[PDB]
Design a protein around this ligand. Structure first.
Ligand SMILES: O=C(O)[C@@H]1CCC[C@H]1c1ccc2cccnc2c1
Length: 166
Protein backbone atom coordinates (compact mmCIF):
# COMPACT_ATOMS: atom_id res chain seq x y z
CA UNK A 1 0.00 0.00 0.00
CA UNK A 2 2.94 2.45 -0.56
CA UNK A 3 1.15 4.42 -3.34
CA UNK A 4 3.00 7.42 -4.97
CA UNK A 5 1.77 10.13 -7.33
CA UNK A 6 -1.98 10.03 -6.61
CA UNK A 7 -4.30 13.07 -6.52
CA UNK A 8 -6.88 13.11 -3.70
CA UNK A 9 -10.39 13.75 -5.22
CA UNK A 10 -12.53 13.22 -2.06
CA UNK A 11 -11.81 12.11 1.56
CA UNK A 12 -11.44 8.54 0.37
CA UNK A 13 -10.98 8.43 -3.52
CA UNK A 14 -7.45 8.94 -5.04
CA UNK A 15 -6.58 8.85 -8.75
CA UNK A 16 -3.43 8.38 -10.87
CA UNK A 17 -2.65 8.12 -14.58
CA UNK A 18 -1.01 4.68 -14.44
CA UNK A 19 -1.22 1.11 -15.70
CA UNK A 20 -2.86 -0.91 -12.88
CA UNK A 21 -0.54 -3.89 -13.66
CA UNK A 22 2.52 -1.69 -13.15
CA UNK A 23 1.08 -0.16 -9.95
CA UNK A 24 0.42 -3.66 -8.53
CA UNK A 25 3.88 -5.10 -9.46
CA UNK A 26 5.63 -2.19 -7.69
CA UNK A 27 3.35 -1.56 -4.68
CA UNK A 28 2.19 -5.24 -3.99
CA UNK A 29 -1.01 -3.87 -2.30
CA UNK A 30 -3.17 -5.87 0.10
CA UNK A 31 -6.03 -5.86 -2.50
CA UNK A 32 -6.07 -5.32 -6.27
CA UNK A 33 -9.55 -5.23 -7.88
CA UNK A 34 -10.24 -7.05 -11.13
CA UNK A 35 -13.06 -5.94 -13.48
CA UNK A 36 -14.38 -9.50 -13.92
CA UNK A 37 -17.27 -11.25 -15.66
CA UNK A 38 -19.53 -13.83 -13.92
CA UNK A 39 -17.53 -16.90 -15.07
CA UNK A 40 -14.14 -15.28 -14.24
CA UNK A 41 -12.92 -15.69 -17.86
CA UNK A 42 -10.16 -13.07 -18.10
CA UNK A 43 -10.13 -12.57 -21.89
CA UNK A 44 -9.85 -8.83 -22.46
CA UNK A 45 -9.74 -5.38 -20.83
CA UNK A 46 -8.21 -5.05 -17.32
CA UNK A 47 -8.98 -8.74 -16.60
CA UNK A 48 -6.88 -9.97 -19.53
CA UNK A 49 -4.01 -7.66 -18.53
CA UNK A 50 -4.01 -8.74 -14.86
CA UNK A 51 -4.22 -12.44 -15.79
CA UNK A 52 -1.38 -12.14 -18.37
CA UNK A 53 0.78 -10.47 -15.66
CA UNK A 54 0.28 -13.64 -13.55
CA UNK A 55 1.21 -15.83 -16.60
CA UNK A 56 -2.25 -17.44 -16.39
CA UNK A 57 -2.01 -18.45 -12.73
CA UNK A 58 -5.08 -16.22 -12.06
CA UNK A 59 -7.13 -18.03 -14.78
CA UNK A 60 -6.30 -21.55 -13.48
CA UNK A 61 -7.28 -20.53 -9.94
CA UNK A 62 -10.46 -18.79 -11.26
CA UNK A 63 -11.54 -21.95 -13.18
CA UNK A 64 -11.19 -24.04 -10.02
CA UNK A 65 -13.24 -21.44 -8.07
CA UNK A 66 -16.03 -21.62 -10.69
CA UNK A 67 -16.09 -25.40 -10.90
CA UNK A 68 -16.53 -25.56 -7.06
CA UNK A 69 -18.71 -22.51 -6.36
CA UNK A 70 -20.49 -21.68 -9.61
CA UNK A 71 -20.57 -18.22 -11.31
CA UNK A 72 -20.83 -14.92 -9.53
CA UNK A 73 -23.88 -12.69 -9.78
CA UNK A 74 -23.71 -9.27 -11.59
CA UNK A 75 -22.92 -6.81 -8.78
CA UNK A 76 -21.17 -9.55 -6.80
CA UNK A 77 -17.54 -10.46 -5.99
CA UNK A 78 -15.15 -13.08 -4.65
CA UNK A 79 -11.67 -12.89 -3.02
CA UNK A 80 -8.94 -15.03 -4.58
CA UNK A 81 -5.11 -14.90 -4.48
CA UNK A 82 -3.35 -11.85 -5.86
CA UNK A 83 -0.39 -14.05 -6.93
CA UNK A 84 2.59 -11.83 -7.79
CA UNK A 85 0.42 -8.68 -7.95
CA UNK A 86 -1.13 -8.34 -4.46
CA UNK A 87 -1.99 -10.33 -1.33
CA UNK A 88 -5.55 -10.80 -2.68
CA UNK A 89 -7.51 -10.08 -5.87
CA UNK A 90 -11.11 -8.89 -5.35
CA UNK A 91 -12.89 -10.01 -8.56
CA UNK A 92 -15.91 -7.67 -8.98
CA UNK A 93 -18.64 -7.92 -11.63
CA UNK A 94 -20.06 -4.60 -12.85
CA UNK A 95 -23.02 -4.63 -15.27
CA UNK A 96 -22.32 -4.99 -18.98
CA UNK A 97 -24.79 -2.25 -19.97
CA UNK A 98 -24.09 -3.03 -23.65
CA UNK A 99 -25.86 -6.39 -23.04
CA UNK A 100 -28.83 -4.83 -21.17
CA UNK A 101 -27.62 -5.42 -17.59
CA UNK A 102 -28.98 -2.63 -15.38
CA UNK A 103 -26.74 0.29 -14.65
CA UNK A 104 -28.25 0.24 -11.06
CA UNK A 105 -26.04 -2.78 -10.46
CA UNK A 106 -22.93 -0.55 -10.73
CA UNK A 107 -23.72 0.70 -7.19
CA UNK A 108 -23.95 -2.96 -5.93
CA UNK A 109 -20.62 -3.66 -7.66
CA UNK A 110 -18.83 -0.76 -5.91
CA UNK A 111 -20.42 -1.75 -2.53
CA UNK A 112 -18.02 -4.80 -2.50
CA UNK A 113 -15.02 -2.41 -2.07
CA UNK A 114 -16.40 -1.38 1.39
CA UNK A 115 -15.34 -4.82 2.74
CA UNK A 116 -11.64 -3.76 2.37
CA UNK A 117 -9.89 -0.79 4.04
CA UNK A 118 -7.53 -0.04 1.10
CA UNK A 119 -7.84 -1.09 -2.57
CA UNK A 120 -5.98 -0.53 -5.87
CA UNK A 121 -8.72 -0.55 -8.53
CA UNK A 122 -9.82 0.28 -12.11
CA UNK A 123 -13.14 2.03 -13.05
CA UNK A 124 -15.89 -0.63 -13.12
CA UNK A 125 -18.13 -1.16 -16.15
CA UNK A 126 -16.00 1.27 -18.22
CA UNK A 127 -14.18 0.17 -21.38
CA UNK A 128 -15.60 -3.13 -22.83
CA UNK A 129 -18.56 -3.11 -20.33
CA UNK A 130 -19.86 0.10 -22.06
CA UNK A 131 -20.64 2.46 -19.15
CA UNK A 132 -19.57 6.07 -19.38
CA UNK A 133 -16.31 6.23 -17.31
CA UNK A 134 -17.16 9.58 -15.74
CA UNK A 135 -20.53 8.11 -14.61
CA UNK A 136 -18.60 5.15 -13.13
CA UNK A 137 -16.30 7.52 -11.15
CA UNK A 138 -19.48 9.40 -9.85
CA UNK A 139 -20.95 6.03 -8.60
CA UNK A 140 -17.58 5.12 -7.03
CA UNK A 141 -17.52 8.50 -5.21
CA UNK A 142 -21.25 8.20 -4.12
CA UNK A 143 -20.84 4.51 -2.91
CA UNK A 144 -17.32 3.64 -1.74
CA UNK A 145 -16.57 4.61 1.90
CA UNK A 146 -13.12 2.92 2.25
CA UNK A 147 -9.87 4.17 0.68
CA UNK A 148 -9.64 3.50 -3.04
CA UNK A 149 -6.64 4.23 -5.30
CA UNK A 150 -7.87 4.33 -8.88
CA UNK A 151 -5.40 3.69 -11.70
CA UNK A 152 -6.54 5.12 -15.05
CA UNK A 153 -4.43 3.97 -18.00
CA UNK A 154 -5.55 6.43 -20.73
CA UNK A 155 -4.17 9.97 -20.18
CA UNK A 156 -7.02 11.62 -22.17
CA UNK A 157 -9.60 9.93 -19.92
CA UNK A 158 -7.58 10.73 -16.74
CA UNK A 159 -7.49 14.45 -17.66
CA UNK A 160 -11.25 14.43 -18.38
CA UNK A 161 -12.02 12.77 -14.99
CA UNK A 162 -9.82 15.23 -13.02
CA UNK A 163 -11.32 18.27 -14.84
CA UNK A 164 -14.90 16.96 -14.19
CA UNK A 165 -14.14 16.02 -10.52
CA UNK A 166 -12.23 19.27 -9.66
O1 LIG B 1 -8.12 3.12 -17.04
C1 LIG B 1 -8.51 3.09 -18.28
O2 LIG B 1 -8.04 3.78 -19.16
C2 LIG B 1 -9.57 2.04 -18.54
C3 LIG B 1 -10.98 2.51 -18.13
C4 LIG B 1 -11.72 1.24 -17.73
C5 LIG B 1 -10.74 0.10 -17.89
C6 LIG B 1 -9.35 0.75 -17.72
C7 LIG B 1 -8.17 -0.10 -18.16
C8 LIG B 1 -6.98 -0.07 -17.45
C9 LIG B 1 -5.90 -0.81 -17.83
C10 LIG B 1 -5.96 -1.63 -18.97
C11 LIG B 1 -4.89 -2.43 -19.43
C12 LIG B 1 -5.06 -3.20 -20.54
C13 LIG B 1 -6.28 -3.18 -21.20
N1 LIG B 1 -7.31 -2.45 -20.82
C14 LIG B 1 -7.17 -1.67 -19.70
C15 LIG B 1 -8.26 -0.88 -19.28
Amino acid sequence: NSFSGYLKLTDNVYIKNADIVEEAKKVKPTVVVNAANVYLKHGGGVAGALNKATNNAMQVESDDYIATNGPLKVGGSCVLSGHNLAKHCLHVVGPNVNKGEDIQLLKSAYENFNQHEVLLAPLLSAGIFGADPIHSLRVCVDTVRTNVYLAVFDKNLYDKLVSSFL
